[PDB]
Structure 1
Amino acid sequence: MMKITDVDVWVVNLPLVNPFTSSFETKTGETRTVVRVRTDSGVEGWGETMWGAPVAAIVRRMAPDLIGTSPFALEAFHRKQHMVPFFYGYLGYAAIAAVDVACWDAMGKATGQSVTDLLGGAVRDEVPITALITRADAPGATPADLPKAMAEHAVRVVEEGGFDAVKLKGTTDCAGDVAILRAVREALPGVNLRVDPNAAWSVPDSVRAGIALEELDLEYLEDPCVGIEGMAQVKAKVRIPLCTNMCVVRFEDFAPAMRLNAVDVIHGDVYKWGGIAATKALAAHCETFGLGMNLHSGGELGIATAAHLAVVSSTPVLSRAIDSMYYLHADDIIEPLHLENGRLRVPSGPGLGVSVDEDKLRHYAGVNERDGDLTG
């Protein structure tokens, strides 16, 4: 009969090993929000979600009403907070997800079960991850030299890391993106290969590039352009599976995207969709419509990755190499997850199966206090 007694929130800054360039920005660290839910039985559940001050602010506003409730009562919590994402958008889903994850952790600890086992049990014990490559990996390169430099980098990363998949972060320079992919495919004929321009290409440029890229047999083309309408126009012309984490980001988007035939693959992400049950539900929706599914990464540290691992472990349709920034981090706030030969081991043991280093938590919260958010 657990009742929540405390909800505490921190914001942390953690460092990457090397810079990371999307079409959007170039980052050198993660800012994350960490939540601990305490109960009257002494159980402590931990959650973690994307971004800093504004996400923490939402969690702290939801907290007073969480006091005295059961961590098992997630349906009631989500319904109570139904309007939060309407106003706060992605940050609203993210804030709700932190609480959601912390409650699953607490539920597992209270019952002596892994979150994986509360989600249907394991169908796999290891989760392959994806090598993320960006133009920041070829700092010196001239436009003429960029494709070769990127391909040589990709080969090193795959050979050293054992990655099953490689994903290029695309840019506004779509012709250059295509040139890079051609060189990477030539160097790695057998690797699953993706490109993600983060919606930076126009629809006509996405069609022209997509046609050019057909010969490379990409696993998918991820968000070439903005919007359900544009994505559907691309899917109508281009014979490459089309993936999104930008035009379908909530259930309200799903029926319209299906009727308009906008996508072939959807990325789940607990922090984007507001919780673990939502992500299991999304998996079922993908199976019903014959869609592929993968997981998107928003810069998860160990707590948030452990939640995603529980989801992948227990979800048949998540059979691909997921996106994960985890291997690119220089430190964590839990004892490190097991990463070997390009796959993460699913934690075992009660809850998320992680142990939080509260000294590192305190330290990196201090770093954030002095340095400010790296996000936002």
Structure 2
Amino acid sequence: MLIREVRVTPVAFRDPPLLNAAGVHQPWALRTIVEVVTDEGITGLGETYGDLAHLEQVRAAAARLPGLDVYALHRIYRRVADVVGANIVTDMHGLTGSSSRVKTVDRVFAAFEVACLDIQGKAAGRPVADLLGGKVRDAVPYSAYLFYKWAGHPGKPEDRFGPALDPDGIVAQARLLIGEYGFRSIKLKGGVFPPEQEAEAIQALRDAFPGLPLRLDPNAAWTVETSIRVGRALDGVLEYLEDPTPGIDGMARVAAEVPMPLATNMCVVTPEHLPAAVERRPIGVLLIDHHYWGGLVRSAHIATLCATFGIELSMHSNSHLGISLAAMTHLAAATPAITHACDTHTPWQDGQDVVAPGALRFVDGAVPVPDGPGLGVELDRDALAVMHEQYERCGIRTRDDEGYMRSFDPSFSTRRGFW
């Protein structure tokens, strides 16, 4: 089961003007689709970031994989490390923490690892969840990922979701997403408005949706002092407070003085961060993410490590398609410690996808583990062609929420310890 060829396809798809600490999402989100093909013609799919520097590394690594076996994940990892060499790929927004050598290698590797597991599952006639110990739950709950947002991108058609710039608007957005998908947990993206206004929105969500766990995620937009004041004000309201303030030190100081656990996908984002995290305890909850922790198996290993130290697991999302959703779902289904609802941007992509439509559905807020072999998805090659053509002419090559926001408000800068 040697790799014969690895096809790498950058894609772009429409995204609404979702606001965050770093500015606002651009009208196109980028991804890179990977398809691994064995000598005997079995295919596997992976999905990763579309930023140009990353795309270049994925292409370079892909070109050096033919001849390696799809079970030889350690060897494929070493080959990716060789290709990445000295390169460290940084991003412009910082919303998944710092860049490093290992995180760069893990980011490049993960697209291939997922595709190799898809192939191993197909060879065995088993879902990827079976390669990870078998599903421990039939369906994986996801949260409603709420954002403050403009009605549309300036100069472009307004989208069907409506604006959300205050508690009423956020509650209406929640009703819309929950009505459609059945989400039983709610997350609000913050760091956009003054904290008291975001606390108000959280309270409005609590009143409108009794019983549903709530999370608030300012992406490090707050000082330690502000974080403590907000955490205390929200006593008994949040499942967790996610990245209120920047850094392990500041997070640890906040965590000691607020009544709910803190979570992160910013100050702990690669394994080298974990010993410092265990010592200072900046978090009670880690949002794992196979796209930068190095694939499904490495993510599963990290879940075991976290559980051992009493750190619970959730899952971080970036704008993504159905290959990533299938991978997320198999990983969460087969990992006992991933016990919190996972995040997904899925609703915001409004049905855009490169896989056939029937395999991944939300039922009562959860995605049932696909039944087919491998990831349980089928590439729609026309849909891939449509999105690749969009990439070619979309005029965006690297995600830049801050630069895009600055085009409207020149004085804007990413909020980091700002309120």
Range class of TM-score, shorter chain: over 0.9
Q: 2:316 aligns with which of 296, 302, 313?
A: 296
Change (3 A) 1:219 1:374: farther
Cα distance in 2, alignment partners of residues 141 and 107 from structure 1: 44
Contact kept in structure 1, 2:8 and 2:62, CA below 8 Å: no
* 1:55–1:92 CA contact under 8 A, matched in 2: no
Matches within 5 A, 1:238-253: 238-253=258-273
Q: What residue is the counterpart of 1:24 in the other structure? A: 22
Alignment partner for residue 192 of structure 1, among 213, 219, 232?
213
Distance 1:140 1:50 in 2: 27
- Tell me if the contact between 2:136 and 2:334 (Cα under 8 Å) persists in the aligned partners: yes
Q: Which residue number corresponds to residue 351 of structure 1?
A: 374
State the partner residue of 2:50. 51
Report the counterpart of residue 8 of structure 1 in structure 2.
7
Amino acid corresponding to residue 48 of structure 2 in structure 1: T
- In 2, the alpha carbon distance for the partners of 1:86 and 1:243 equals 29
Aligned partners of 1:211 and 1:86: how far apart in 2? 43
Letter in 1 for 2:218: P
Q: Describe the superposition over 1:312-349 as per-residue Cα deviations: whole angstroms up to 9, x where unpaired.
A: 11111112211011232131000122222221121122
- 2:3/2:36 contact within 8 Å kept: yes
Matching residue of 1:177: 198
Contact kept, 8 Å, 2:128 with 2:374, in 1: the verdict is yes
Residue 355 of structure 2 is matched in structure 1 by 334
Q: Establish whether residue 286 from structure 1 lines up as the match of residue 285 from structure 2.
A: no
Does the CA-based 8 Å contact 1:137-1:153 persist in structure 2? no
Q: Which residue of 1 aligns with 2:223?
A: 202
Matched-pair contact (CA < 8 Å) for 2:52–2:397? no
Which residue of 133, 153, 172 maps to 1:120? 133
**Aligned equivalent of 1:237:** 257
1:345–1:372 Cα change, 3 Å? farther
Distance in 1, matches of 2:190 and 2:261, equals 17
Letter of the structure 1 residue corresponding to residue 209 of structure 2 = L
1:127-276 matched pairs, under 5 angstroms: 127-136=140-149, 146-172=166-192, 173-216=194-237, 218-276=238-296
State the one-letter code of the partner of 2:131: L
For residue 18 of structure 2, give the secondary structure of its aligned residue in structure 1. strand
- Distance apart, 1:91 and its partner CA: 5.1
| 1:141 positional shift | 7.2
What do residues 2-40 of structure 1 show as CA deviations (whole Å, max 9, x unaligned)? 111111111001224x43222223224421101111111
Q: What's the CA shift for 1:176?
A: 1.5
TM-score (norm. length: structure 2) = 0.83
Q: TM-score, length-normalised on structure 1?
A: 0.92
Relative to total residues, which structure has the larger helix share, 1 or 2? Answer: 1
- Stretch of structure 1 that moved more, 86-95 or 297-306: 86-95
Q: Is the 8 A contact 1:147 1:183 kept in 2?
A: yes
Alpha-carbon distance between aligned partners in 1 of 2:6 and 2:259, rounded to the nearest angstrom: 49
Amino acid at match of 1:209: V
Unpaired stretches in structure 2, ≥5 consecutive residues: 90-98, 152-161, 400-419
**Distance (whole Å) between structure 2 residues aligned to residue 200 and residue 243 of structure 1:** 14
Between the aligned partners of 1:126 and 1:119, the Cα distance in structure 2 is 15
Change beyond 3 A, Cα 1:240–1:303? same
| Bigger shift: residues 105-114 or 276-285 | 105-114
The share of aligned pairs that are identical, in percent, is 39
Question: RMSD between aligned alpha carbons?
Answer: 2.0
Cα gap change, 1:229/1:113 in structure 2, threshold over 3 Å: closer, same or farther? same
Q: 1:144-188 CA distances to partner (integer Å, 9 max, x unpaired)?
A: xx2233234334433453211111110152122112212221222
What secondary structure is seen at the aligned counterpart in 2 of 1:6?
A: strand
Q: What are the superposed Cα offsets for residues 244-287 of structure 1, whole Å, 9 maximum, x if unpaired? A: 11110011001110111111000111102121111101110121
User: Is the Cα–Cα contact under 8 Å of residues 51 and 373 in structure 1 kept in the other structure?
Assistant: no
Paired residue for 1:107, among 120, 126, 133? 120
Q: 1:153 to 1:60 in 2, by over 3 A?
A: closer
Cα deviation, residue 236, structure 1? 0.9
Q: Between Structure 1 and Structure 2, how many residues are aligned?
A: 370
Matching residue's letter, 2:356: E
How far is the alpha carbon of 1:289 from its aligned partner? 0.9
TM-aligned CA distance change 1:297 to 1:140, over 3 Å:
closer
Amino acid in the other structure paired with 2:128: V
For 1:60 and 1:233, locate their aligned partners in 2 and report how far apart those are by CA, in whole Å.
42
Q: Which residue of 2 aligns with 1:311?
A: 331
Looking at structure 1, the residues matched to 197 and 373 of structure 2 have their Cα atoms a distance apart, in angstroms, of: 48
AA matched with 2:385: R
- Give the drift of 1:207: 1.3
Higher strand share: 1
SS in 2 for 1:327: helix
Structure 1: distance between partners of 2:144 and 2:314:
14
> Conserved in 2, the CA contact under 8 Å of 1:53 and 1:373?
no
- Listed one character per residue, the Cα deviations across residues 214-250 of structure 1 (whole Å, up to 9, x for unaligned) are 142x101001111111110111111111101111001
- SS of 2:305's partner is helix
DSSP 3-state at the match of 1:243 = strand
